Design an enzyme around this catalytic site. Sequence first.
Site: not given
Lengths: 958, 961
Positions: A162, A339, A458, A427-429, A476
């Site tokens: 996140g 949090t 495009y 966050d999936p985690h 990557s």
Amino acid sequence: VPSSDDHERISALFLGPKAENAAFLQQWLTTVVAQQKAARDAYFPDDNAFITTDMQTSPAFAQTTKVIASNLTELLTALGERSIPFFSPRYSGHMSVDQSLPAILGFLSTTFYNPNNVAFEASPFTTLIEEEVGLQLSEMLGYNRLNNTEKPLAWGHIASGGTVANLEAMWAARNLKFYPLSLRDASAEGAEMEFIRDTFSVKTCVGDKKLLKDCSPWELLNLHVSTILDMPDRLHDEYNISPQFLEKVMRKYIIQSTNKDTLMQRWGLTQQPVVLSPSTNHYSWPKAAAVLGIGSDNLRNVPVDIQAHMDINELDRMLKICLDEETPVYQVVAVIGTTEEGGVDRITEILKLRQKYEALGLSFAIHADAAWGGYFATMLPKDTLGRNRTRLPKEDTTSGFVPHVGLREESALQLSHIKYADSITIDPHKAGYVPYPAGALCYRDGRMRYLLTWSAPYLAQGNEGQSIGIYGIEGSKPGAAASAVFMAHETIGLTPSGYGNLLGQAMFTCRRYAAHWSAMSTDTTSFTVTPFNPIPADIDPNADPAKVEEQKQFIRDRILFKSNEEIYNDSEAMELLHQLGSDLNINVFACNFRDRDNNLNTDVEEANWLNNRIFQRFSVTSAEENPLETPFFLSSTTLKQSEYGVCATEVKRRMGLVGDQDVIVLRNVVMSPFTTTNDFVGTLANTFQKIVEEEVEYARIRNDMKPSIHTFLLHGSGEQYYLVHTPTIHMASGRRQIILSVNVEGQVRQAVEAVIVHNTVPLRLDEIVDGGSFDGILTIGKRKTSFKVKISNIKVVKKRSLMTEDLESAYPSLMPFYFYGTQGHAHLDHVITVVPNIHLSAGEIQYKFDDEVSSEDLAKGLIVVAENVHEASMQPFPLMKDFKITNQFFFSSGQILRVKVYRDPYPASTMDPIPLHDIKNQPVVTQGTITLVGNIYVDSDALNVASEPTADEDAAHV
Amino acid sequence: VPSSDDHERISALFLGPKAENAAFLQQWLTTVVAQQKAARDAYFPDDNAFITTDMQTSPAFAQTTKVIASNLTELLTALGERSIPFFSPRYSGHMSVDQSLPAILGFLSTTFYNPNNVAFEASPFTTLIEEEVGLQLSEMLGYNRLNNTEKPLAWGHIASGGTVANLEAMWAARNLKFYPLSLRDASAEGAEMEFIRDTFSVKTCVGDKKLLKDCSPWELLNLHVSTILDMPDRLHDEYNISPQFLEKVMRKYIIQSTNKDTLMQRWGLTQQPVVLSPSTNHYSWPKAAAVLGIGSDNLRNVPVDIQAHMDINELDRMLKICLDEETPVYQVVAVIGTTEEGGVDRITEILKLRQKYEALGLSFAIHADAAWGGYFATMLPKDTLGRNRTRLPKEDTTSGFVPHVGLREESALQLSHIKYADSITIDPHKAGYVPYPAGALCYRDGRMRYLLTWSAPYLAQGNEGQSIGIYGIEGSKPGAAASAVFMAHETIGLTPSGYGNLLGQAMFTCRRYAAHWSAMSTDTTSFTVTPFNPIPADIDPNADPAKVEEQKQFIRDRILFKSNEEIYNDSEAMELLHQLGSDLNINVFACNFRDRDNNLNTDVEEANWLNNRIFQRFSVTSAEENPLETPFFLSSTTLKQSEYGVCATEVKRRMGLVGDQDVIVLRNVVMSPFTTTNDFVGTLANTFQKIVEEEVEYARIRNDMKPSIHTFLLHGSGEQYYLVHTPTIHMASGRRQIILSVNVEGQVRQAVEAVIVHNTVPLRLDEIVDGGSFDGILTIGKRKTSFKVKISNIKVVKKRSLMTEDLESAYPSLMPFYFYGTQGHAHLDHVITVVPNIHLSAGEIQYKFDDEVSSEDLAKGLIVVAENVHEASMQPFPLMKDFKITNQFFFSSGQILRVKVYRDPYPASTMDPIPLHDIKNQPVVTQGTITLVGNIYVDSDALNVASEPTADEDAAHVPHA
Ligand code: NA
Ligand code: NA
Ligand code: NA
Ligand code: NA
């Protein structure tokens, strides 16, 4: 009759607290291997092996397999012995828990193919998976994933976390804000799109249609998100401008290329645009501002209210300031699941403020930081009248009932409005039960992602797969992460009956914990526990305390230590339990203590001592601890007054504390669906209580003011003697700065090493008054021989309180010393105005001033301020074990202090504060120099809690 | 006698091309499960089960397990059928390969604990692992990991990838550059550290000792890295200032807080500092500049030399410009293993340049982008005189010999000097054989990491573990990634005998490939293959061609299709092979073709057509393909003239091409140690050759100029008729713009719908000359019937070449048309000056000019430029299937063109260029308007290669077993 089916359904998703599901996992791993083999066989089946059986039985191959096996077992052993056991319900500290097996298996299955989602031709399958995951998340959050409708088409992607999702959202908002100025430049006279400027209109913020070229800079800085995102499509629709040409021409004008500050300077703009965000926002917000060249000074923090929600009236007032000063606003952040407390900002109110300010000409993007809260939108109710199929019955009643419960009404309201934010981090985690790494960002209007590039959208073609990995920070990226999230979504289900069931069981567990935090302590326990979220009858600060105590006892009688089945069958108990604790599964609470006469501590720093020691007992913070010996895990945080303002004040008030200091609290994130099984939570509660009681005993010893033995340095010669108490903060009874002139009756006389006096009869420092006396014992440094002595004719030169309430919070710029004694025989003692601090005394000094000071002034005790000792700049001083005193140390023999001399404006004895911040505005008596000769005492440990043993060390010494 | 041991040693590290090692993996996974159970049992052993047997056999539990099993099998089946098979040595395209099992197992083992390396208390074990991995990488790269020495203490960490590592390095360099200005502000009169200003000195860039407060802004902007990083320690040592105080005070003055541009304005600074980086740097560099608010305009790109290395003389010239203009330099990037060619920049020369410019007062950080190249430093020679223990013999000679080979001398030189860069990016998930995600950044002096924060380094204490996750871009992070890298490092070994062995086998394989790329084509094959790295006898552009051909023939006779054993025993062959191909395992090469008379194509766009189709044959670029039917995988890139300059020119020259256009090349990253087994490389070469020959046949058909059948639009009435050729770029024989006046003999008379004429007897367009004639057929729009006609009395009004060499590179701002016919009956035809383009013709129009134009001018054909049609802004035009013509289309009946009229300055017929860019400076004949009436023809597909079938579609239409 309660059904066990919903808890059984999710119990299969995890390896389990005792790895109960290991046989299933073994089967699934065997399937992974078999399929890998089948797939590699299927790719050109007529290819023979490259790794032959003769190669596999050779000594070098065998050596490599032995090394792999040995390294693997060593890693597995160390992991089990040294990691935090998040897999156990004994862990309930941070956002950590046993992760879902479908996610772990999705990641593992895919890493054998190691697809790279940066480019389609490296990930033709997991690019499609990740796109589908982004649209699953978007739809779950309430965005639109359907093409060719009137609503914008959302887009989502996976990022490392996140933090990067928030960075991307702020980056897009940064580039969005300046796009219309770049386009105005690109269509200026002489520029490549000049030919549109006489016809190309926009709606200004207030809704008026104007030529882009006729807008003022302020108007261009306040176009709506949709107005801006529509521009490339509009240019194509209205002039047939190609995306290729548009992107090429705009390259030289957009801030991606020029940076925003060169653009602002050309436009004569001086107000930096800002991001508005709650004062307690995650660190990733000021960090993104710093990264993006906005600067954290331009992340303007909005104060919070007493439940740590962004204060809507404060946001209103700060938006008004921006409007009046023409400071553009990139973005307003709504934190959906904070949090530190799991609270939900009122995004409904933020949306109303946006409408209000758009009517006045001010516009901003809205971002929902739902990194933690996002997945709880699976608990929003969904229309069930669409399902008409047979449903396998829920008739199991085996041991193992855990109910789910639903969202609080306010949480549901905000969760159902996050779909109006322009972007959402989730966050999936975190609450998705997917292992790291897996963060995500969703855009309400997917076209927003093109702002992160130099490109224009495009038209997609079927014969070329589109890369989903060029629209963010990273390059990557593991397609395996997409497979993991996808497996979680498809197996658990992004619905109330899937993730909603799992998170609802966690939420029931959270409320069961909160009942203990809310009712554990009584009127007569040695400790108190105060929840951050008050119980219903306690919300009113003027509530009848009888009703508050009645509701606590109701909790003790009807919830605590009962089985889930008993509680669920008690309607009143469930209704009350529903209202306890955090909005979204993050309970905050804090302890206080009483003395042995049952008087509550009011010192914030002593409550902080206690709560930090409790945290230490229930956490692993060093490599020295054996983490398998910790029976229960919490987290901890500091509510800084400057960030939590009225909220921190109210926390301290309800704890019974008085003071402005930052307050330490305990944090109990709840993700486990298993803790209430067999009322295991009760065990944890009892464990917590036992430890708290231990630490409270230490607190009581720390703060016991009974008479005791005290230490004093001796200054002076036979002519006249002074005692300088050696204060400490390790004992409440030592928190006094005391200097007395005295007579010493005894056989002591030696004209290097410290001369120290202890009282032989226990006494209280506060009882030392003019005329008093007491017997003592002298000890010349390390000499084994001692001397009995009588201290008589005491005259108090200084007696000040070093209690928290009587100290300052800001260090003096220049170091102050008490300056006392007789003519030609003066002495120095550093004034302790703040802790932590350092004791500095010098018995033998040489002073020279431009005016001789009178015996009266010297006897009364002056204050000398060293112009060449910048005390605050050195604080905190290193502990004694961490620095070596040499003749270069500023407080050593031979050093010269250049001083101004002042009269002490406070009485000799005082238990009140003695602020010296503006001592420089007091009349100057004289000025000069002091050379330090000898009898020097230096101690940076006695006035600093950092030198004390930790709770781990004390507990190990029992 | 060659030994099989070193290949056998690394064969056990991978699941294998055919999963040959699946039983070993099964064992290790079983051990993982067993240990997870033992570990969870060991934590409070007296805790009973939370998930009981009765729960596990309940119908809801069983249903969840069936769903898991079903989803898992579906995922595995789909992954196997739809992913790229990186695991096979048939794959050799991008930086992808079968990953190491130790890494996969370290990640898996750790995800069951899911440690979070953002904070020590969430990762007490894997924080230590990650720190140790950072120091392992640092030491391997030549940095110092020892405490209490004279060398700086390095520090490293894991990031999601090299993109974020490069971003952090640039972020650190940005904040480093401005730190001394911030400290000067913090010690100004009235500020919190004013008391240091009369005694606190620094060494300026050239070495003079000056009070910080007496330095000019330029001097403060050029302090050396070490000078700046030393400042917090120096303040503590010299004034006993605490790190806590320093951090707090500096927060308000550092650009993390204020941003650099407000600071710059307060200091009166107007030159944006720059990053200097080679023109071909990875996209992560301009992207980081954009992210950081530096702006990609201030990433100044350094041109490359003919082998794609940063041109050191050009860097020198650009640093001199920076010095003279007082533009600070954040950073110079040396790329160690370029993404596209695997080349190594000469960082030795960059270090020399740094010494030169420091003596002149200009300083900069140096960053080595070794994302790809970094792990090749494991191949650097190491002192072996420290090892004296027994070594198990290397005496295996079973089938399966694959040798390792060593670095090229130049590669070794640069790799051994990257330890002088101030920071190094390196990707375990590139050449470390660790799965994504695993990037890494190492600082030569670990103190640099504190620039990524508002903090000053504190003295560490034993009773509090230090969090390693507050020194970068990211937040939560997987401790599992550190375990993956740690396992790969321990198991494979960061030494010449470990990783050096694996990468040396991959490098031998790379050279075996390069031998084929370097010698496959002959003087008489239908294709040519040209390597980016010439063979030794070919490096000299004026070399004796007899010597070049002799070395190619040597390669055919002594290397190609031989066994590893024969080659290795051939000293001369090994010496030559050592010099073939890429520096660091990324071969670049490109194909060209010849006609059927063996004439070489010189058209860059036809070479591009060929190479793009070959790429398509050896890649998966759409979801329609079955990836399991691709027998060999390459990647591809375009060398843009504007970025590769002289290097792109030299590639085109050595392929035999002429032209300024961007050139497409093929790219062969080699990470497999297995491809040379049984000479499988040869099989692949032959596969490649076969496909190339197929595509060359298509190219030959595409470019055959034999007589053929052509299409013409008919304009005019019985008074006078014109034929307008419908050009195409799909056939070289159609690449002409032709307008003729003609007589039409026949029974034709039809007064909406297009009237079209084809010639019935094949002919060449270039042979159409004044006076000619030909038979043809008319076709009224959608009419099934046709009409015999005779085209006679032909007069060529325009005949121009649409070949690549005769077209322009930039589109016209305003659209030009040919304007021809008779008075009161003129016609329009869009001038094709660039491709791709769109055919636009109008047979019936109405014109009104401020001066009547003469019949001679109309007959010869004028050029009218439409002020209200911005051609460049619309290019490329969408394909016909993607847009529908309505009355809103700018070129439809009723549209009015406001035009300037010019005389055509070129002859009626011409095979040379006809540039019209500056037509606006020709004398203006007259001006006015043209209204489009009817007989309108629009085609955006015929002049655009994007309308053609791909090579994948053509091959799918060819039957096979
Ligand atoms: Na602990
Ligand atoms: Na007091
Ligand atoms: Na293909
Ligand atoms: Na020509």
